[PDB]
Amino acid sequence: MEKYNPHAIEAKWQRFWEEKGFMKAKDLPGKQYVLVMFPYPSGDLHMGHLKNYTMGDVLARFRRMQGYEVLHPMGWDAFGLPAENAALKFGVHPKDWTYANIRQAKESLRLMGILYDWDREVTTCEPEYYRWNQWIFLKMWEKGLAYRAKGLVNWCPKCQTVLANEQVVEGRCWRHEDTPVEKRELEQWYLRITAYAERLLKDLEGLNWPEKVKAMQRAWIGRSEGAEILFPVEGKEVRIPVFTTRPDTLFGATFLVLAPEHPLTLELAAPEKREEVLAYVEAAKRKTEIERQAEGREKTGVFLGAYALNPATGERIPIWTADYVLFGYGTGAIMAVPAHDQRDYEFARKFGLPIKKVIERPGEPLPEPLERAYEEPGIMVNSGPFDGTESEEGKRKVIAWLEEKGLGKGRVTYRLRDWLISRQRYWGTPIPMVHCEACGVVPVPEEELPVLLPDLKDVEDIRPKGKSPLEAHPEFYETTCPKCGGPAKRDTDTMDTFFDSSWYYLRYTDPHNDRLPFDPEKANAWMPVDQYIGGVEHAVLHLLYSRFFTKFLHDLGMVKVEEPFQGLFTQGMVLAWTDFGPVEVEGSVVRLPEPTRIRLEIPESALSLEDVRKMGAELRPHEDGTLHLWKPAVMSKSKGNGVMVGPFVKEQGADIARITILFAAPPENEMVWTEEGVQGAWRFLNRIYRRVAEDREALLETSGVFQAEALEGKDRELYGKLHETLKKVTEDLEALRFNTAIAALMEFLNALYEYRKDRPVTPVYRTAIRYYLQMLFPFAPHLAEELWHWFWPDSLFEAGWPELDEKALEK
Numbered sequence: 001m002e003k004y005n006p007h008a009i010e011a012k013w014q015r016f017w018e019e020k021g022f023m024k025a026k027d028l029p030g031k032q033y034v035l036v037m038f039p040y041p042s043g044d045l046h047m048g049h050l051k052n053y054t055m056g057d058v059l060a061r062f063r064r065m066q067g068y069e070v071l072h073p074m075g076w077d078a079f080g081l082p083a084e085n086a087a088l089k090f091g092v093h094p095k096d097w098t099y100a101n102i103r104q105a106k107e108s109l110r111l112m113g114i115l116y117d118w119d120r121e122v123t124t125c126e127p128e129y130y131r132w133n134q135w136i137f138l139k140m141w142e143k144g145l146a147y148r149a150k151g152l153v154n155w156c157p158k159c160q161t162v163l164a165n166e167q168v169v170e171g172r173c174w175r176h177e178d179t180p181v182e183k184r185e186l187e188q189w190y191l192r193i194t195a196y197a198e199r200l201l202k203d204l205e206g207l208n209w210p211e212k213v214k215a216m217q218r219a220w221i222g223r224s225e226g227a228e229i230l231f232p233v234e235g236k237e238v239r240i241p242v243f244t245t246r247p248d249t250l251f252g253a254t255f256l257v258l259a260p261e262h263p264l265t266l267e268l269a270a271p272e273k274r275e276e277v278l279a280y281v282e283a284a285k286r287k288t289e290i291e292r293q294a295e296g297r298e299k300t301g302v303f304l305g306a307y308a309l310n311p312a313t314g315e316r317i318p319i320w321t322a323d324y325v326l327f328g329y330g331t332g333a334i335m336a337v338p339a340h341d342q343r344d345y346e347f348a349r350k351f352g353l354p355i356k357k358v359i360e361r362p363g364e365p366l367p368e369p370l371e372r373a374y375e376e377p378g379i380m381v382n383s384g385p386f387d388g389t390e391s392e393e394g395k396r397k398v399i400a401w402l403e404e405k406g407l408g409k410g411r412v413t414y415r416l417r418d419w420l421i422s423r424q425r426y427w428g429t430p431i432p433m434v435h436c437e438a439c440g441v442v443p444v445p446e447e448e449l450p451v452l453l454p455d456l457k458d459v460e461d462i463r464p465k466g467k468s469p470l471e472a473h474p475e476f477y478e479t480t481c482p483k484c485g486g487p488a489k490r491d492t493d494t495m496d497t498f499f500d501s502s503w504y505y506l507r508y509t510d511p512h513n514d515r516l517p518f519d520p521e522k523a524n525a526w527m528p529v530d531q532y533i534g535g536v537e538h539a540v541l542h543l544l545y546s547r548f549f550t551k552f553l554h555d556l557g558m559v560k561v562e563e564p565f566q567g568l569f570t571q572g573m574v575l576a577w578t579d580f581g582p583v584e585v586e587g588s589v590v591r592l593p594e595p596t597r598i599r600l601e602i603p604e605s606a607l608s609l610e611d612v613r614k615m616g617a618e619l620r621p622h623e624d625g626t627l628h629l630w631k632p633a634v635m636s637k638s639k640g641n642g643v644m645v646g647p648f649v650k651e652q653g654a655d656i657a658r659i660t661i662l663f664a665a666p667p668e669n670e671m672v673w674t675e676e677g678v679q680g681a682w683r684f685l686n687r688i689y690r691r692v693a694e695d696r697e698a699l700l701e702t703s704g705v706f707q708a709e710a711l712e713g714k715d716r717e718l719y720g721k722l723h724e725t726l727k728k729v730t731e732d733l734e735a736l737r738f739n740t741a742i743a744a745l746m747e748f749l750n751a752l753y754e755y756r757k758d759r760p761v762t763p764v765y766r767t768a769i770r771y772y773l774q775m776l777f778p779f780a781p782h783l784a785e786e787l788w789h790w791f792w793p794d795s796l797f798e799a800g801w802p803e804l805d806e807k808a809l810e811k
């Protein structure tokens with residue numbers, strides 16, 4: 001008897017499904033929008049990417065079989081840093097590189113049996129797409145959400161461009177994890193995402209997202225209870241307003257500090273102090289923003305010779321000016337609480353200012369004298385009627401008290417900063433603005449879009465050296481101001497890649513509209529995404545920016561929903577056993593030579609055998625005569641441990657790869673691609689094929705019609721197991737518990753073998769085989785479709801999803 005052979009059959013069914021267009025989505029839909037994060041065409045796809053994309057295909061096939069109108073699209077996040085950095089590493093032009101990668105990616109996806117509605121394909125680096133990035137940018141400008149500002153920004157020396165706050169990971173560039181980000185002062189473009197901070201925070205509650213992702217966004221937004229407190233100046237009419245997120249420490253404010261540029265610094269300066277103060281103010285203006293915001297420099301300042309009254313204690317406190325207080329932040333003035341702010345502590349210690357504790361540390365009380373500030377929450381003390389109140393709650397109590405007495409007002413702030421979107425790079429969407437010498441910054445008219453990216457052919461030309469490559473192309477920027485008509489200069493910076501990906505899911509609903517980013521009617525019929533699948537690494541990047549874009553577009557009246565992804569599933573990373581290098585073992589201690597330690601990226605030069613076991617590593621004898629340390633590591637190019645689709649599928653097969661991935665572990669967890677896994681997929685698929693082939697002849701001469709109630713013995717038992725399996729598989733699929741759905745099919749397959757030990761091929765058995773192939777389709781579509789055609793005329797896409805028999809479940 002012949003055995004399962006994936007070789008010719010897979011290509012056959014792949015073409016069949018495409019020609020039939022089973023996965024084509026209607027312009028207007030029950031519907032299911034199954035979306036996976038489109039890739040950066042920066043390289044070849046490996047099984048890691050395929051875990052993400054196979055998961056989407058499984059769900060899309062299942063939903064399509066159930067009769068839902070399914071939208072399952074694919075596209076290319078082809079603009080920005082990912083694509084350009086990769087292309088430039090190999091001295092290749094970004095456009096050539098991108099399209100070659102897209103070609104390869106499409107093949108990798110097709111070879112795995114993944115089906116998309118390719119008629120909705122989008123390529124962000126194309127004018128047909130980015131002209132709408134510009135359209136959206138213009139709307140944000142008009143709505144007060146896009147502005148230009150000068151200030152300190154993050155800068156990656158390797159990328160040679162500024163980066164948004166979300167693109168800085170552990171102080172490192174999101175693309176160059178080995179390069180620390182630097183600070184610079186430049187005038188850039190920002191998207192006022194903070195205007196939506198409260199809604200972004202509040203709307204997380206109804207989302208069917210992993211709690212871990214919600215927590216990351218909440219912490220990134222960082223809402224804080226603060227207050228603006230008023231301090232009366234002795235002998236003067238003015239009451240100095242100060243901003244603080246620690247209103248709970250008010251009774252501990254022993255002095256005030258005004259920014260050198262604050263108007264009151266010179267105005268309140270005593271006559272005999274004016275000279276010294278004026279000298280300090282001028283010296284402060286000579287410093288740069290960076291120098292002023294320095295965090296480890298010496299403490300300097302001058303006593304103005306004026307006093308203020310602490311509104312809570314009614315006590316007199318000195319007023320100083322010091323360059324560590326920034327004029328552009330808050331009110332440009334602060335109340336200093338040395339006992340609970342380390343910077344204030346050091347300033348107070350240096351200039352002999354009072355230090356008063358008002359927040360006591362739970363457990364062991366703070367010592368006297370205080371050697372450093374206590375900045376964590378505690379219990380209020382020496383705070384009048386507030387004594388005994390827990391810090392955080394105390395903030396609210398003090399704010400209410402201040403407002404009631406007219407001594408200040410509550411002020412909520414967010415750690416979240418506005419989104420820096422301009423980049424000094426060539427490969428990206430040109431910002432649709434013009435700079436006129438007379439009018440200032442003027443927007444390009446909507447009807448003039450798109451502002452085409454100049455077609456530069458010299459790669460050395462495109463390479464970023466510090467300024468935007470466009471700054472060297474007058475044929476591009478020299479233009480006329482749309483307002484006055486005189487000579488003007490087009491903006492030379494481009495939009496970051498995340499602008500493109502913040503709404504691509506909406507473009508899929510109307511990929512060819514050349515009058516609007518999309519028609520509200522079409523978008524509203526498909527939105528929101530019912531199930532989004534993608535990596536957690538996007539928690540405060542794409543998964544935050546998108547929510548912002550959608551809320552904005554909703555406010556524009558183009559989108560009914562306010563949340564783009566109703567369901568989100570973050571898939572665990574696929575890992576691969578990776579060789580890190582030789583080691584030497586002596587007793588229970590493993591010595592790691594520098595090269596090996598460096599590749600492992602750990603500070604230990606020595607590990608116990610237990611440490612090796614615990615980190616999931618093992619020592620394997622190597623032909624070089626030494627022991628090497630191997631450990632599963634995230635599958636990626638940089639690691640050189642990628643398992644590419646083309647080669648694997650050629651030597652093994654798509655269903656083998658799909659089962660290996662899907663059965664390895666719960667999808668939310670990480671998994672290690674292994675030979676044992678591959679062999680296990682082979683064993684399972686061979687076992688399915690063998691069961692059907694063994695009974696093929698009898699099955700062909702058997703009818704599938706029978707009366708459930710009339711079944712008895714093993715026949716009745718099989719019918720029950722069949723429906724129990726259908727229930728388990730259906731529910732598991734709906735919850736994306738793909739590994740247990742497969743385990744259920746493996747279990748039922750065992751029941752089929754057991755059944756045949758006692759019973760011949762029967763109508764109920766034929767029906768069990770029919771349902772089995774249907775339930776198998778989402779997972780191993782090629783084999784299921786192949787076996788299905790041995791007995792039936794239509795495709796598995798046309799037979800639908802098996803109907804569950806509730807009664808069969810009883811007892």
Ligand SMILES: CC(C)C[C@H](N)C(=O)NS(=O)(=O)OC[C@H]1O[C@@H](n2cnc3c(N)ncnc32)[C@H](O)[C@@H]1O
Nearest residue numbers: 037038039040048049077501534535542573574635
């Ligand atoms: C939605 C946009 C911002 C996504 C962006 N283009 C992007 O993240 N692209 S990507 O780097 O090509 O990744 C695409 C998805 O594949 C997932 N992925 C990569 N490597 C993986 C491994 N080793 N295991 C599992 N999943 C992997 C990545 O998380 C993205 O979801």
Ligand SMILES: [Zn+2]
Nearest residue numbers: 156159173176
């Ligand atoms: Zn970088």
Ligand SMILES: [Zn+2]
Nearest residue numbers: 436439481484
């Ligand atoms: Zn003008």
